[PDB]
């Protein structure tokens, strides 16, 4: 009912599109015998296509006048409803993974600034060090906030500028 959109089960265009896809698949599915390989391939394709169309319509995702699904990205409209998975939790999942990556890369590039000729370590990596740091970053929100309160990430204005 939000934005004039209707749940995607009551969309005549959505079901018409599903029927269209199934007809287009079957018209060239009827070209092969039930025993050959291409026939089984088309059978499995139709299987997961029907599965596409069935599994989407659960917990509610709005389809518009076109019958296609439309993602709701506002927190608050995903709340007070059931749309928190459209894009609200994927945001936090990507933030977690991107943190993880940046944290690991930063701690690597910092721990390499101490040894002689660090440039080599950037073309010939320290594989065991990278593997160790790769399996230690999945608590980075804890380490990031308290390393921020710490101050070990703010450079005290000792860099090259021109102005």
């Amino acid at each position: 009912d939000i934005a004039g959109l209707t749940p995607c089960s009551e969309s005549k265009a959505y079901n018409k599109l599903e029927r269209k896809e199934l007809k287009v698949l079957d018209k060239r599915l009827k070209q092969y015998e039930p025993g050959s390989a291409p026939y089984l391939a088309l059978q499995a394709t139709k299987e997961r296509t029907e599965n596409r169309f069935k599994t989407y319509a659960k917990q509610g995702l709005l389809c518009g006048n076109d019958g296609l699904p439309h993602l709701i990205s506002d927190p608050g409209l995903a709340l007070r409803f059931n749309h928190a998975g459209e894009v609200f939790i994927p945001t936090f999942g990507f933030l977690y993974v991107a943190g993880y990556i940046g944290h690991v890369g930063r701690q690597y590039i910092i721990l390499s600034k101490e040894d002689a000729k660090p440039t080599d370590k950037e073309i010939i990596l320290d594989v065991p060090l990278a593997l160790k740091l790769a399996f230690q970053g999945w608590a980075w929100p804890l380490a990031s906030i308290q390393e921020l309160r710490n101050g070990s990430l703010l450079e005290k204005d000792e860099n090259i500028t021109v102005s």
Partner: protein
């Protein structure tokens, strides 16, 4: 005209790989700038830039020739094996007029 080769001119070892840009003494010192990588790539084959030893240059060229023909032969073998394992070559052969050639299945 005769044959003239040398025995064990360069010992086989994985050391010179650990120092990219060895063929260019200017590059072998170290990558202090990101241009080092691009010069490594743009000069690996520049045999006459490595050193003025035209003997070594001719050896490098005569080796890179086999290096290319090996890839050529693996390419032809890959084409033949695609035609062999997964393709309609028998179907095409029994009816070439309408059946179309296909040798790649996703």
């Amino acid at each position: 005209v005769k044959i003239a080769v040398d025995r064990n001119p360069v010992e086989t070892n994985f050391e010179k790989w650990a120092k990219p840009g060895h063929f260019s003494r200017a590059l072998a010192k170290g990558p202090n700038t990101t241009t080092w990588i691009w010069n490594l790539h743009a000069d690996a084959h520049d045999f006459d830039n490595h050193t003025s030893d035209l003997e070594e240059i001719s050896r490098k060229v005569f080796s890179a020739h086999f290096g290319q023909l090996g890839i050529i032969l693996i390419w032809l073998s890959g084409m033949y094996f695609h035609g062999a394992r997964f393709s309609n070559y028998e179907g095409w052969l029994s009816d070439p007029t309408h059946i179309k050639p296909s040798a790649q299945v996703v």
